[PDB]
């Protein structure tokens, strides 16, 4: 839809998009994450995590240290605007968030917090 995006994270440690623009008419925005491939969550799990660009590093840093069972995310992290679960191949997860949490002119980034993945698995999101 206009107010959602389907995104894939694959066994090549890559998202199939690196830029998302959100229409100002959207009250909510939904991201549907899926995982083509064959590798399980413990070696190639992906999540979709959204924060301001400013916060990306801190979110990734705390997440990796939080470990696998916590989906590589710090619990109750207020820097995170939206997050999916960490998924393995063949699994899928969605998240919806309020577009009011986005700001005009500000850059947000989405990324995977599985250790190292953010080297390639990142993109920008901003209001259209």
Binding-site residues from annotation for Cu cation? 46, 112, 117, 121
Q: How far is the CB of 26 from Cu ion (least distance, A)?
A: 26
Rounded to whole angstroms, the Cα distance separating 93 from 85 reads 7
Residue 124 sits at φ, ψ, to 5 deg, of -105, 145
Taking CB under 5 A as the binding criterion, the range among 23-31, 45-53, 66-74, 91-99 that sits at the site for Cu ion is 45-53
Binding string, residues 74-113; x marks residues near Cu ion by CB under 5 A: --------------------------------------x-
Interface pick for Cu ion out of 41, 46, 48, 89 (rule CB under 5 A): 46
- Give one DSSP letter per residue of 87-113, joined into a string: B-TT-EEEEEEEGGGS-TT--EEEE--
Rounded to whole angstroms, the Cα distance separating 115 from 61 reads 9
Cα 122 to the center of its chain, rounded Å: 8
Q: How far is the CB of 47 from Cu ion (least distance, A)?
A: 7
Q: Which residues form the interface with Cu ion (CB under 5 A)?
A: 46, 112, 114, 117
């Amino acid at each position: 839809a206009e107010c959602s995006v389907d995104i894939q994270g694959n066994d090549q440690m890559q998202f199939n998009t690196n830029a998302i623009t959100v229409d100002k008419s959207c009250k909510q925005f939904t991201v549907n994450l899926s995982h083509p491939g064959n590798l399980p969550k413990n070696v190639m799990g992906h999540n979709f995590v959204l924060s301001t660009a400013a916060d990306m590093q801190g979110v990734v840093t705390d997440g990796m240290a939080s470990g696998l069972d916590k989906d590589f995310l710090k619990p109750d992290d207020s820097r995170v605007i939206a997050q999916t679960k960490l998924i393995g191949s063949g699994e899928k997860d969605s998240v919806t968030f309020d577009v009011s949490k986005l700001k005009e002119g500000e850059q947000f980034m989405f990324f995977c917090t599985f250790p190292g993945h953010s080297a390639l698995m990142w993109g920008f999101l901003h209001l259209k």
